[PDB]
Every structure is written in C-alpha cells, then in structure tokens.
RNA sequence: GACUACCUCUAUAUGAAAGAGGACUAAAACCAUAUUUCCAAACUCCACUUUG
C-alpha cells in the first residue's frame, strides 16, 4: 500500500500527517467505533443496513471510483452473496468527513482528495476505461498487492460477482507454494542490501548495489504472476 | 443549454455581438442576427439536458436511455422490457419527480385548478410497462402511454429557450429600458442632484428583514443541522419569505432590488453553487450587519454605472458603442497603463540623481526647480557613470539635468490624459526647455555623442556579450562567422513582430521534451534533433545555452515572424502531425489552416484572440490551455528547422579548445536610426531590464491592432530602441576606485553585509594583497532605489549578514559530486518506480537533496546574491502598487469630467465629490507616496503591509479592485518561491498581518511522495517578513 | 467568501432568477531568469455538489 491521505477533519476531530501505516490505521479504526444514525425515510432499511455488513469483520469492501458524473460507489460484499452499495457522499455525511485545510495550494477539492482515503479502506477499485462512448474493461485491483485483473464482458451487476471470485484466487496463491518461495527470496536480498548500506552509506551509488535492485525488483514482477494464475 | 455562445454549431463558432439597442447572437465575422436559428440548432442539447433533469445522481443506465428514446426518435433503440421492470423506478427518478409534480402549460392564461398537470412518473411508467408485453419494449406502444411526460419536456424546453433567447437581446449596453437600469438611472439623478436616493430603515421595513434573519438563524441553529445541508435549506427558508411579500415585490422596484441583493449576498457567504469548502458564520446574517451590506453593495452599483458613461463620453461614442469598440477601447488601456508604469519608474530614477528626499512630482516643471536647486554635486556624476557608460563634468551639469526631464515630460503628458491618442507626433520630442526659458534641441545637445558611441559599438558589445558567457572559449573563431555572416538574416535589435512569442527558455526546455521521450506509446514525433542537453551545471553546456539564447534572439526571431513562407511551412507540420492519427481525441482540432499572403503577425492575432476568447470556458472546466502548447510546437520545430537548413548544427557539440585564436569576428550590421529617437533612449536608459523587456511585449500586442501603414513605422522604430536598451544592460564598473573613493569606504560599506575580518579573504579581495573586488549586486542597488531600504533591513540582526560557518560550509563537501549523485538517482527511479517504496533508498535521496540545497543557499550567502533577490522582490511590488493607484487615477477623470459635462466650475466640481463619499484628500495622499515610489527614500513612516491597506482604502470605491488588491500579493510571493497566509480581517482591525510565511514545496520523486525540499530555503523567509514588517 | 472576484440581462417568483452573458471588467496568463520537480498524448455536446 501508500499511506498518503492529506489532513481529514472528522466529525470535529483532526487527523495530521497520515503519510505513515500507523496514523492510517489509527484512522480507519477511529472510523468503525465512530457512532451515527441515519434520518432519512426512503432509505432508513438501506442505509443502516449498508453500516452493518460494513461494521461485521467477515466484509469486503469495493470502490468503484468514478461510477457516474460524480459520483463514487462503495460496495460492501457479504461472505455469501449480498452486494449493497451507497453513494460516497452518504458516506461522508453520515460520518462527517471533510478537508482539514481546504484553501492550501497544494490541495484540491474533496472529490478529488478523498480517493486517497477510499483506497486505504477498500480492498478492490474498479475503474472503467470507456473506450470511446461505450465501455471496453472494467480493471479490478487489489489494494493489499497490487495484482491487477481486466474485466472484458462483465456488467456492473455481472462485476460484482466476480470479485467474490477474484479475491479467492489471490489469497489461495499468497498462503502456499510459489509465493512462500518468491518472498523468502525477495527478503533475502533486502537483508544483504540493508548490511550493504550498513558497512558504508555510499552503497547506493555503487553499481553492484544497483544491480541487485534490478534483481529485487524480477523477482516482484514474477510474484505478482503467480497471484494472477 | 449551459453554453449558448463559444460553441461549434454549424461547424462554425458562436459570438454575441452587444449594441446600445440590443443584443445579437451572431456566428464568427459576419453580423447577422442569427439568433433565432443558432438558438434553434441548440436544441438537441436541451433533449439530453432534460433527461439529466428527470435522473438520479447514481445513474442507471438504462433508465437514462428509455428517456432520451422517448423525447428523441433516433436517440430511442432497444432494451429488455424485463430490464426496467425489474429495477424499482422511484429510486432512479429526479428529486422534483418521485412524487406528484404540478406544471401549468405556457399558452394555458392565469393559474386555475383544471390549467395545473399532475404526473406521478413512476406510477405512470409502471403502468405502461405492465402494458408492454415483449421482448423488447415498442416504441409507438409504450411513447402513446407516455404522452403526459413527452408534453413536459416539450413544455420545459419551450420556455427555458425563451428565457434565454430574450435575455440575449435585451443585454444591451448601458440599459435605461430595464427594471433594474431605471432604478439606477433614478438614483444616479438623485445624486448630482445632491438628494438622498433610497433609505435603508424604510426599505427594510417594507421587506420585514426582521421576520427573515431570525428564521435565518432559527434554520442555521436548529438542532441535528448540518453543513452539507444548510446553504440548501437556508436557500429554501429565503425563498419562502419572498413567497409571502411577493405582493410588492411586483409593484415597487426598490423592495425588488433590495431583495436581488440579499439573494446574492446569500450565496457569497453561503454558497450553493460553488463547493462549499467552509462553514459559513452566524456573523454574516444578522439584523444590522445585512443591512449595512445591502447598503454597500447597491451603492457600488451606481458607482459603476457613474464611471461606465463616464467612459462613454470621454470617448465619443455614447450612441454607437459597439461590442468591438469596448473590446477596443480594452486593448489600448491596456498599452496605455504599461507605458505610464515604466514613465513612473524613470521619473523614479531622476529623482534619485537630483535630490532623493522629494515627496511630489518631480516632472513638473516648476516643482523640478525646487529639487534642482539642492543637488549633492558628488553623488551625480558617480550615478551618471552608472546609467551612462561616458563620464560628464562639472560644467555639464545644468543642462543635462533638464534634458533628461525634457525626455519623460511630454510623452508622459499626452499619455495620461484619457483621451484619442496620435501615436505619430508622440515619440518625435525634438526639443526642451530649461528655465532659469531657452529651447535647446536634441541634436545639438550633449546626448548627440551618446548615440554614435553607442550605435557603433553594437559589434562589439557583441563580442564582448560572448566573452562573458565563455563562447569563445568553447567555439573556433571560424564558428562564429558562419552564424553572422548567413544570407538575409542580419542581428537586428529587433525580437519579434508578433503578439505570444515565447522565450528562449520556454523552447529550450520544452523541446527537449519532445526530443527526449520514452519512445513506448503511438509517439508524437516531431523529428527534433538540437535539444540535447539540460546540464545547467556544466561549462559546456552553459556555453552552448548562451550561443543558442542570441542566435534565436538576434538572428532568427526577426526573419521566422515576417516571412510568411517560414512561419507557414512551420505551422503546417504541427497541424498535420496533430489531425493525422487513429481517433477523434484531437486537440488542435478546432483551429485554422493559415492562409497564403497572410502576414504571421495576422495569423497570430488570431490565435491571440482565440486565446482570450476560451479562458472564462476552459475554466469552469478543468481543461488545459492547448493554444500555449500550440505556440510552443510552432517555435520549437521553427528554430530546429532554421539550424538545420543552415549548416549551425556544431553548436550542439561546444568541444573546450587549447590552442588560442588570436583572430576577429566580424558581424555586419546596420541601423537607419536617425536622431529623432533619442528621446525615447533617454527614457529607457533609466529603465531596469525586466521592465524594458515586459513592455517591448506590450508595445507589440498594440502594434498588431493598429490599421495605418505608418504610425505601425511608429512603434516598430520606438521597438528597436528598446532592444538597443537591452544590449547595455548591466555593463557596470570595473576600476575599483570609481565606485569608492577610499580603501575604508569600500570596507566600511562592504561590511554591512558580512561585517568580520572576512573581507581580507579570496571571494572579497581580488586574487592576493588587500586590492577589493566589487560585488556586481551591491551596485545594483546603488544604481536603483533600495539602498537604504536594504541596509534597513540587514541591520536589524546579525545572523542575516555572512558569518564565518559560512564560508567553512563551501569547503564540507565537493557539492558538484552530490548534484551528479543526484542525477544518477534520479534516472533510476524512473526504470525501477518501487525504488520510492524502499524506505532506506529514499531516505538516502532525500539527504544528498537537502546537501544540495544548504549548499546553494550558503554559495549566495556569501557572494552577495541574496540581496539581489530582495531589490527585485521589492521593485515588484511597489510597482504593481502603482498599477493600482493610475487605475483610480482613470476613474476620477471618468466621474469628475461627467459632473462638469452636466474656481469658478471648479467649486461646484468637488463638493459633489464629498457626497458620494469618493476621492478624498486623505486618498490623494495615500495614492501619491504609491504611485510615486516614497517607501524608497530612506525614511519608513509606514511598512509595505501598511502600502497594501492604503491600496483598498484608495480602491474601497469598488470591489472588484478592492478585493485584488489582496489576491495579487500573496501572487508576488509565490512567484517568488514563498507562501503567505494572513490573520482574519475581521479580528486585526481590518488591516494585513502576517499569519505564516513558509519557502514553496517542490516535490520530487512521483505523486504520492514524501520527498520534498524548498523552493528557497527557511532563512530567506525570516529574511522576506521582516522586510514586509518594518517602519 | 479580502485571499476564497465583480458586472449586465433574465419573472409561470418556482424544481426555483439554483438561468444565461463578459477580450465588453477586473485579476491572471504571455514577456531576455540563478540551479534539482521525469516526460509525450488526451475533439465535441450534457449533468451540478443535499442521509431530502
């Protein structure tokens, strides 16, 4: 993952310097014990059942990033079946959420700024291409790795049955096998790079260092095939 | 629907065209009323706007298709009857739908129980779908059922088109038909007339403000409220109110006017159109302080419209004012206000040379007897020597003095005076005068001299220009007369003759981005094969740079702008390498071929004017501006293709030399100045560099609007004595003792700024002894202003001035080692990208970047480059202080000159002033010390802070220029490298305080990054507000 | 919204004047600077930000 989200004021709280994996995940758990009721009359049965699969451990979670003009689409999927899904702004004002300084120069609006967030909470993000007017594939992502798949014939409703499936796939190739001996690999260069630096500071600029770099990085590349399969 | 005009419409663009009698939609160079079918053929964009109208945010997709097949017939195709019925039809409707909707049809008269239409859409399309019974739904069965809904489209387009196409032709200009404009027609007459126009308490009595503001607040502090939602519902409780004194709102006129403004002071500071990124305040609605709003904002729109036929009679065109004579009237005020900053700057100049402490108008001629009469003798003829390379006596000066004055007074004059302009006889100047009255000419005169040992050492100002820069070193002597010496091109002082020519750095920088490309995709090739290198820290290079920088400038920028076949057969690649690629995504798509026998300064006056025409549209959108990468793609294969077809391709490969060339470089030049230029010379060498450049780009957007075949001769003869201007620059001093008259005034002066035992060293002696070397920026700031602002400023403490951890910072480390460390990183992190989610390697590339810059920060420390900066920073704001203050210099003639239209007429003038509370003598005060540069003569009384307050009292008259003023100092500084944040005005007594100063990000390393450094460094920002802050 | 604009026209006074227009009026942008930010490509029409 990147931990990169820009300052969130949250229900009267403000969250600073989230660029770490601690302040992240203090955030997201500052999330789910955050308590709310919800107001509305047409959507009283779907809104508060959509913060319940959410809260319940056994949940996956899917973005969609830019479903419509503006709009984003989390989707929660139970472990048998059960797809909901809210707009993104139901979720930001059922639970608060805004820019803790909006007029800085480096920031942009929070239609913008907040898929840093929505990418720390999800597991999956769907994309679509829409090669000219009509759709072309949907690219599904993981957000833990990075293995990316691309959907070709699939509808929204057809998608969505298949990231139950998608995600079988990579958790059965990170338990065993291949990945179990790809990784010890990877380690074992860190590990002489990381006592490489130690003896001088200089060994970055080395070549043979370089070198060894290019070897950790096929050996991710081949990691992330063996996910895929 | 959203865009009536810029627009394609038959494959031809949309303008409206303004008159007094009306308005007009019109295509692109005609000037017909086109505006009932232009706004015809804009009707299938009302069919796919209504059906976002009937849609939900989260948009079925299918739902948004059996609505756009049922207004439209070929729109309409095929969809599972199954489908829809399956999906529940309230969820994806509208808001305004989802329950019962009532509309009255247009042609129905009055409002009555059987004219109103009731529609419940979703129970409608329920049941007609249970009618529809197959496959795929039948157009003309399930269309008859939804005939109820096809007459409200048909209802909502037909109206909303009519309100928009009479809105076009009654946006007439300076409308006296109008509510609205007969109200403040009525109270401009009860103003001249010195009466009292409306009364605040009365009119918000009638409107019973007391029942609203306190429903206002009673909706803003309601419990469970929330900010997402409450400018929607404080929009709703507002409308509510009007609903029940709409009464008179019909009736009165003024009660309508006071109702528009507090509709729009509701969405100023509680938006709904405009991302509402802050909480409003409770401060900002309550009884007292939104009346005491309404009674400024609708008193500024009667100072508007005082100052708008101001400007119509001061020009005579009160009854044909055309949309193309205001768009006119624009360009040459906008040449006109350049050319009076820079007349300002200079009269700032000599000022400086006869006797700085003077306060007022030196360019009087009376009030210049005053000041000459108290001259330091001593200080004149060394400030002489550094504006002019000659050297004058004693005897010389009474006569000099007066013809410099004589150069700025009568073109100054004619200038100001808001009036029709004869640009021949405005640069003639052959004489003035000097009182003791004797009319000197210029011919005869001293200045004579000052051009025939100054046009006769153009070729070697040029040698010596390249000395400076190391061309010779790195080039033969053979090199260099094959670049001189090319058939028709000839190294004019002139750059360019057409508006938008880039810069050098601009071509140089982004042609080496379209050379140097990952070479992966469908390339957009360019075929570019001279930009090379970007090694800005080589010799090599830094030689290569500086010969491409003036073979561009001084060779090829005059012939490339007015051969027509040069400039065309370059404009001609760049659109048939755009439009010749699979796809429609095609940027350049919509702009012209240029024709034969068109002039270049022809086809880029219209590619100004499309510039200028699309920038409100490319940013309610965020769209790039794809004319500035246009002009780039143009210049860039331009002067790649000039240095090929001539053989100046070495130029690429510079190849350091031994052996010495004891050989001549002989240029050709000539020049057909004669001497009635030499007036305008004397103005622009009292200018700095940056402003003679800023407005030779002026000076030529102006000439490509004039029509005359002469009087273009004008300006084309005023350019080049700019660009003779350029060529001298900063030749400066180089005998030490013409500068200082002692050893110990040298160091006594010298030691301001680093104030040790550090000046008997090798960067502040010459190589050995104790000979003194000067400091190209401490004589800078003596030849200027600034002198004894920045002496202000460095003694306040002693850690600004150069210590001895200074200096032993320059000899840590190699320094040109870590910026080739630097590099090689840098090049990696491209091929490897996971290289920036590897902690140890980017904790690395971050300490050899900040090695980088503490060292560049302590290598201007010590050579004294960091009080350049400040000069600079400084000059540009008291300048754009003064592009303020001549703004309220027009708007008093625009006002005073309508009064006296309608002491003997000078008593009945002012008092009529002091009733509308304008120009004051309190003002007049305020907005000369701007406009006549007083914060740099020594003595503070006020801060520049305390200058940007006196701006928006001068400039509280109205608030579009009041609240600039604000928005353009926070620009300065962040041009500059630096940031500024500014305590609220509501708790500082309204007045500017420094909230945070911080040195700009520049983010290395990807977008999702840590790795960052400053733009400049953090003691220069201490350095910054203390110049910003001080009396 | 000083920063975080302003002005003109528009009345079925509401699904809303919550609409269009502006080189027309301002600010920017453009311009002869001292060096680190990888870069190239990316037509047009239409939504309009609300637990309603």
Same mark, same amino acid.
């Given at each position: 993952?990147?931990?990169?989200?820009?300052?969130?004021?949250?229900?009267?709280?403000?969250?600073?310097?989230?660029?770490?994996?601690?302040?992240?995940?203090?955030?997201?758990?500052?999330?789910?014990? *955050?308590?709310?009721?919800?107001?509305?009359?047409?959507?009283?049965?779907?809104?508060?059942?959509?913060?319940?699969?959410?809260?319940?451990?056994?949940?996956?979670?899917?973005?969609?990033?830019?479903?419509?003009?503006?709009?984003?689409?989390?989707?929660?999927?139970?472990?048998?079946?059960?797809?909901?899904?809210?707009?993104?702004?139901?979720?930001?004002?059922?639970?608060?959420?805004?820019? *803790?300084?909006?007029?800085?120069?480096?920031?942009?609006?929070?239609?913008?700024?907040?898929?840093?967030?929505?990418?720390?909470?999800?597991?999956?993000?769907?994309?679509?291409?829409?090669?000219?007017?009509?759709?072309?594939?949907?690219?599904?992502?993981?957000?833990?790795?990075?293995?990316?798949?691309?959907?070709?014939?699939?509808?929204?409703?057809?998608?969505?049955?298949?990231?139950?499936?998608?995600?079988?796939?990579?958790?059965?190739?990170?338990?065993?096998?291949?990945?179990?001996?790809?990784?010890?690999?990877?380690?074992?260069?860190?590990?002489?790079?990381?006592?490489?630096?130690?003896?001088?500071?200089?060994?970055?600029?080395?070549?043979?260092?370089?070198?060894?770099?290019?070897?950790?990085?096929?050996?991710?590349?081949?990691?992330?095939?063996?996910?895929?399969? | 629907?959203?865009?009536?005009?810029?627009?394609?419409?038959?494959?031809?663009?949309?303008?409206?065209?303004?008159?007094?009698?009306?308005?007009?939609?019109?295509?692109?160079?005609?000037?017909?009323?086109?505006?009932?079918?232009?706004?015809?053929?804009?009707?299938?964009?009302?069919?796919? !706007?209504?059906?976002?109208?009937?849609?939900?945010?989260?948009?079925?997709?299918?739902?948004?298709?059996?609505?756009?097949?049922?207004?439209?017939?070929?729109?309409?195709?095929?969809?599972?009857? !199954?489908?829809?019925?399956?999906?529940?039809?309230?969820?994806?409707?509208? =808001?305004?739908?989802?329950?019962?909707?009532?509309?009255?049809?247009?042609?129905?008269?009055?409002?009555?129980?059987?004219?109103?239409?009731?529609?419940?859409?979703?129970?409608?399309?329920?049941?007609?779908?249970?009618?529809?019974?197959?496959?795929?739904?039948?157009?003309?069965?399930?269309?008859?059922?939804?005939?109820?809904?096809?007459?409200?489209?048909?209802?909502?387009?037909?109206?909303?088109?009519?309100?928009?196409?009479?809105?076009?032709?009654? @946006?007439?200009?300076?409308?006296? $038909?109008?509510?609205?404009?007969?109200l403040?027609?009525?109270?401009?007459?009860?103003?001249?007339?010195? %009466?009292?126009?409306f009364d605040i308490?009365s009119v918000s009595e009638k409107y019973?403000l007391?029942?609203?503001?306190?429903?206002?607040?009673?909706?803003?502090?309601?419990?469970?409220?929330?900010?997402?939602?409450?400018? #929607?519902?404080?929009?709703?409780?507002?409308?509510? =109110?009007e /609903?029940?004194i709409?009464?008179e709102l019909?009736?009165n006129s003024e009660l309508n006017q006071f109702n528009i403004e507090i509709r729009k002071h509701?969405?100023?500071?509680?938006?709904?159109?405009?991302?509402?990124?802050?909480?409003?305040?409770?401060?900002?609605?309550?009884?007292?302080?939104i009346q005491?709003?309404v009674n =400024?904002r609708l008193?500024?729109?009667?100072?508007? /419209?005082?100052?708008?036929?101001?400007?119509?009679?001061?020009?005579?065109?009160?009854?044909?004012?055309?949309? @193309?004579?205001?768009?006119?009237?624009?360009?040459? $005020?906008?040449?006109?206000?350049?050319?009076?900053?820079?007349?300002?700057?200079?009269?700032?100049?000599?000022?400086?040379?006869?006797?700085?402490?003077?306060?007022?108008?030196?360019?009087? &001629?009376?009030?210049?007897?005053?000041?000459?009469?108290?001259?330091?003798?001593?200080?004149?003829?060394?400030?002489?020597?550094?504006?002019?390379?000659?050297?004058?006596?004693?005897?010389?000066?009474?006569?000099?003095?007066?013809?410099?004055?004589?150069?700025?007074?009568?073109?100054?004059?004619?200038?100001?005076?808001?009036?029709?302009?004869?640009?021949?006889?405005?640069?003639?100047?052959?004489?003035?005068?000097?009182?003791?009255?004797?009319?000197?000419? #210029?011919?005869?005169?001293?200045?004579?001299?000052?051009?025939?040992?100054?046009?006769?050492?153009?070729?070697?100002?040029?040698?010596?220009?390249?000395?400076?820069?190391?061309?010779?070193?790195?080039?033969?002597?053979?090199?260099?007369?094959?670049?001189?010496?090319?058939?028709?091109?000839?190294?004019?002082?002139?750059?360019?003759?057409?508006?938008?020519?880039?810069?050098?750095?601009?071509?140089?920088?982004?042609?080496?981005?379209?050379?140097?490309?990952?070479?992966?995709?469908?390339?957009?090739?360019?075929?570019?094969?001279?930009?090379?290198?970007?090694?800005?820290?080589?010799?090599?290079?830094?030689?290569?740079?500086?010969?491409?920088?003036?073979?561009?400038?001084?060779?090829?920028?005059?012939?490339?702008?007015?051969?027509?076949?040069?400039?065309?057969?370059?404009?001609?690649?760049?659109?048939?390498?755009?439009?010749?690629?699979?796809?429609?995504?095609?940027?350049?798509?919509?702009?012209?071929?240029?024709?034969?026998?068109?002039?270049? !300064?022809?086809?880029?006056?219209?590619?100004?004017?499309?510039?200028?025409?699309?920038?409100?549209?490319?940013?309610?959108?965020?769209?790039?501006?794809?004319?500035?990468?246009?002009?780039?793609?143009?210049?860039?294969?331009?002067?790649?293709?000039? &240095?090929?077809?001539?053989?100046?391709?070495?130029?690429?490969?510079?190849?350091?030399?031994?052996?010495?060339?004891?050989?001549?470089?002989?240029?050709?030049?000539?020049?057909?100045?004669?001497?009635?230029?030499?007036?305008?010379?004397?103005?622009?060498?009292?200018?700095?560099?940056?402003?003679?450049?800023?407005?030779?780009?002026?000076?030529?957007?102006?000439?490509?609007?004039?029509?005359?075949?002469?009087?273009?001769?004008?300006?084309?003869?005023?350019?080049?004595?700019?660009?003779?201007?350029?060529?001298?620059?900063?030749?400066?001093?180089?005998?030490?003792?013409?500068?200082?008259?002692?050893?110990?005034?040298?160091?006594?002066?010298?030691?301001? #700024?680093?104030?040790?035992?550090?000046?008997?060293?090798?960067?502040?002696?010459?190589?050995?002894?104790?000979?003194?070397?000067?400091?190209?920026?401490?004589?800078?700031?003596?030849?200027?202003?600034?002198?004894?602002?920045?002496?202000?400023?460095?003694?306040?403490?002693?850690?600004?001035?150069?210590?001895?951890?200074?200096?032993?910072?320059?000899?840590?480390?190699?320094?040109?080692?870590?910026?080739?460390?630097?590099?090689?990183?840098?090049?990696?992190?491209?091929?490897?990208?996971?290289?920036?989610?590897?902690?140890?390697?980017?904790?690395?590339?971050?300490?050899?970047?900040?090695?980088?810059?503490?060292?560049?920060?302590?290598?201007?420390?010590?050579?004294?480059?960091?009080?350049?900066?400040?000069?600079?920073?400084?000059?540009?704001?008291?300048?754009?202080?003064?592009?303020?203050?001549?703004?309220?210099?027009?708007?008093?003639?625009?006002?005073?000159?309508?009064?006296?239209?309608?002491?003997?007429?000078?008593?009945?003038?002012?008092?009529?002033?002091?009733?509308?509370?304008?120009?004051? @003598?309190?003002?007049?005060?305020?907005?000369?010390?701007?406009?006549?540069?007083?914060?740099? @003569?020594?003595?503070?009384? %006020?801060?520049?802070?305390?200058?940007?307050?006196?701006?928006?009292?001068?400039?509280?008259?109205?608030?579009?220029?009041?609240?600039?003023?604000?928005?353009?100092?926070?620009?300065?500084?962040?041009?500059?490298?630096?940031?500024?944040?500014?305590?609220?005005?509501?708790?500082?007594?309204?007045?500017?305080?420094?909230?945070?100063?911080?040195?700009?990000? &520049?983010?290395?390393?990807?977008?999702? !990054?840590?790795?960052?450094?400053?733009?400049?460094?953090?003691?220069?920002?201490?350095?910054?507000?203390?110049?910003?802050?001080?009396?």
């Amino acid at each position: 993952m990147i931990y990169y989200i820009k300052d969130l004021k949250v229900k009267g709280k403000i969250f600073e310097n989230l660029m770490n994996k601690e302040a992240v995940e203090g955030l997201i758990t500052f999330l789910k014990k *955050a308590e709310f009721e919800i107001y509305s009359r047409e959507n009283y049965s779907k809104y508060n059942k959509w913060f319940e699969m959410w809260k319940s451990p056994t949940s996956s979670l899917v973005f969609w990033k830019n479903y419509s003009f503006r709009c984003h689409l989390l989707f929660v999927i139970e472990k048998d079946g059960e797809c909901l899904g809210i707009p993104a702004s139901v979720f930001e004002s059922v639970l608060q959420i805004y820019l *803790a300084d909006p007029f800085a120069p480096d920031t942009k609006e929070l239609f913008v700024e907040v898929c840093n967030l929505y990418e720390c909470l999800a597991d999956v993000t769907v994309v679509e291409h829409f090669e000219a007017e009509e759709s072309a594939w949907h690219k599904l992502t993981h957000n833990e790795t990075e293995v990316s798949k691309r959907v070709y014939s699939k509808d929204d409703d057809e998608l969505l049955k298949y990231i139950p499936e998608f995600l079988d796939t990579i958790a059965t190739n990170k338990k065993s096998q291949k990945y179990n001996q790809i990784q010890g690999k990877i380690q074992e260069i860190n590990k002489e790079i990381a006592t490489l630096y130690e003896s001088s500071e200089d060994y970055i600029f080395t070549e043979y260092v370089s070198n060894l770099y290019r070897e950790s990085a096929k050996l991710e590349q081949h990691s992330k095939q063996i996910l895929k399969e | 629907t959203m865009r009536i005009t810029k627009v394609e419409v038959d494959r031809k663009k949309v303008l409206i065209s303004r008159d007094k009698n009306g308005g007009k939609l019109v295509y692109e160079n005609e000037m017909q009323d086109n505006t009932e079918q232009i706004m015809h053929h804009k009707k299938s964009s009302f069919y796919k !706007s209504v059906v976002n109208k009937t849609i939900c945010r989260p948009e079925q997709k299918q739902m948004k298709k059996l609505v756009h097949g049922l207004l439209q017939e070929n729109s309409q195709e095929k969809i599972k009857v !199954s489908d829809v019925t399956k999906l529940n039809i309230s969820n994806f409707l509208n =808001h305004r739908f989802k329950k019962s909707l009532y509309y009255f049809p247009e042609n129905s008269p009055d409002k009555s129980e059987e004219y109103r239409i009731e529609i419940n859409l979703s129970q409608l399309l329920e049941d007609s779908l249970k009618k529809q019974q197959g496959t795929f739904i039948c157009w003309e069965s399930f269309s008859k059922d939804m005939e109820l809904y096809i007459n409200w489209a048909e209802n909502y387009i037909s109206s909303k088109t009519k309100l928009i196409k009479k809105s076009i032709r009654n @946006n007439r200009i300076q409308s006296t $038909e109008s509510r609205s404009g007969q109200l403040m027609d009525r109270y401009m007459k009860d103003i001249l007339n010195k %009466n009292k126009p409306f009364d605040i308490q009365s009119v918000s009595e009638k409107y019973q403000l007391e029942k609203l503001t306190s429903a206002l607040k009673a909706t803003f502090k309601e419990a469970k409220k929330n900010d997402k939602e409450i400018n #929607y519902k404080l929009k709703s409780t507002l409308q509510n =109110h009007e /609903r029940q004194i709409i009464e008179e709102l019909k009736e009165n006129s003024e009660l309508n006017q006071f109702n528009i403004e507090i509709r729009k002071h509701l969405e100023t500071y509680f938006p709904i159109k405009k991302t509402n990124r802050k909480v409003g305040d409770i401060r900002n609605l309550e009884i007292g302080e939104i009346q005491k709003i309404v009674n =400024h904002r609708l008193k500024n729109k009667i100072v508007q /419209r005082i100052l708008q036929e101001g400007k119509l009679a001061s020009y005579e065109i009160e009854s044909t004012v055309n949309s @193309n004579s205001l768009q006119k009237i624009k360009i040459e $005020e906008a040449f006109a206000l350049k050319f009076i900053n820079a007349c300002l700057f200079a009269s700032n100049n000599l000022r400086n040379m006869v006797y700085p402490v003077c306060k007022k108008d030196i360019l009087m &001629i009376g009030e210049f007897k005053n000041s000459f009469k108290e001259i330091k003798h001593k200080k004149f003829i060394r400030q002489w020597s550094q504006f002019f390379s000659q050297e004058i006596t004693v005897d010389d000066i009474e006569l000099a003095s007066w013809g410099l004055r004589g150069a700025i007074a009568p073109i100054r004059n004619e200038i100001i005076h808001l009036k029709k302009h004869s640009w021949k006889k405005f640069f003639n100047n052959p004489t003035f005068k000097v009182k003791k009255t004797s009319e000197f000419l #210029y011919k005869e005169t001293l200045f004579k001299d000052y051009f025939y040992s100054e046009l006769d050492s153009v070729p070697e100002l040029i040698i010596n220009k390249m000395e400076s820069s190391k061309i010779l070193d790195y080039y033969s002597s053979d090199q260099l007369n094959q670049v001189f010496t090319i058939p028709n091109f000839e190294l004019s002082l002139l750059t360019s003759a057409v508006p938008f020519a880039p810069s050098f750095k601009r071509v140089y920088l982004k042609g080496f981005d379209y050379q140097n490309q990952d070479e992966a995709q469908p390339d957009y090739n360019l075929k570019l094969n001279i930009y090379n290198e970007k090694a800005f820290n080589s010799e090599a290079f830094q030689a290569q740079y500086s010969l491409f920088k003036m073979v561009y400038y001084q060779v090829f920028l005059p012939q490339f702008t007015t051969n027509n076949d040069l400039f065309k057969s370059s404009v001609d690649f760049i659109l048939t390498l755009n439009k010749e690629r699979k796809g429609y995504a095609k940027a350049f798509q919509d702009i012209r071929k240029m024709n034969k026998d068109e002039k270049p !300064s022809e086809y880029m006056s219209y590619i100004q004017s499309q510039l200028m025409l699309y920038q409100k549209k490319q940013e309610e959108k965020e769209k790039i501006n794809h004319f500035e990468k246009f002009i780039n793609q143009v210049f860039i294969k331009g002067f790649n293709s000039f &240095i090929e077809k001539n053989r100046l391709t070495y130029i690429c490969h510079p190849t350091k030399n031994t052996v010495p060339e004891n050989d001549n470089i002989e240029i050709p030049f000539h020049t057909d100045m004669d001497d009635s230029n030499i007036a305008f010379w004397l103005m622009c060498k009292l200018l700095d560099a940056k402003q003679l450049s800023e407005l030779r780009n002026e000076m030529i957007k102006f000439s490509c609007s004039l029509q005359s075949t002469e009087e273009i001769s004008t300006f084309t003869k005023a350019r080049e004595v700019i660009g003779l201007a350029l060529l001298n620059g900063e030749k400066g001093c180089n005998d030490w003792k013409e500068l200082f008259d002692d050893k110990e005034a040298w160091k006594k002066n010298m030691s301001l #700024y680093v104030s040790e035992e550090l000046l008997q060293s090798l960067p502040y002696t010459q190589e050995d002894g104790q000979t003194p070397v000067i400091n190209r920026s401490i004589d800078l700031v003596k030849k200027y202003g600034t002198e004894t602002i920045l002496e202000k400023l460095f003694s306040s403490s002693d850690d600004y001035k150069v210590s001895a951890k200074d200096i032993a910072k320059l000899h840590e480390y190699d320094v040109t080692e870590k910026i080739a460390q630097q590099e090689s990183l840098h090049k990696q992190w491209i091929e490897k990208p996971g290289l920036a989610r590897d902690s140890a390697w980017t904790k690395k590339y971050q300490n050899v970047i900040n090695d980088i810059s503490n060292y560049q920060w302590a290598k201007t420390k010590v050579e004294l480059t960091q009080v350049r900066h400040l000069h600079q920073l400084t000059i540009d704001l008291l300048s754009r202080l003064a592009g303020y203050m001549s703004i309220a210099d027009r708007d008093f003639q625009f006002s005073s000159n309508y009064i006296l239209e309608r002491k003997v007429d000078l008593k009945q003038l002012r008092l009529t002033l002091e009733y509308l509370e304008l120009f004051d @003598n309190r003002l007049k005060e305020k907005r000369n010390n701007i406009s006549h540069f007083n914060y740099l @003569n020594g003595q503070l009384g %006020n801060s520049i802070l305390e200058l940007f307050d006196d701006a928006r009292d001068v400039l509280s008259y109205d608030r579009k220029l009041k609240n600039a003023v604000s928005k353009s100092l926070k620009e300065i500084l962040s041009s500059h490298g630096m940031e500024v944040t500014f305590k609220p005005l509501y708790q500082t007594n309204h007045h500017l305080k420094i909230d945070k100063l911080q040195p700009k990000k &520049i983010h290395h390393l990807g977008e999702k !990054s840590t790795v960052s450094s400053n733009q400049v460094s953090n003691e220069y920002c201490q350095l910054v507000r203390t110049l910003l802050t001080m009396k």
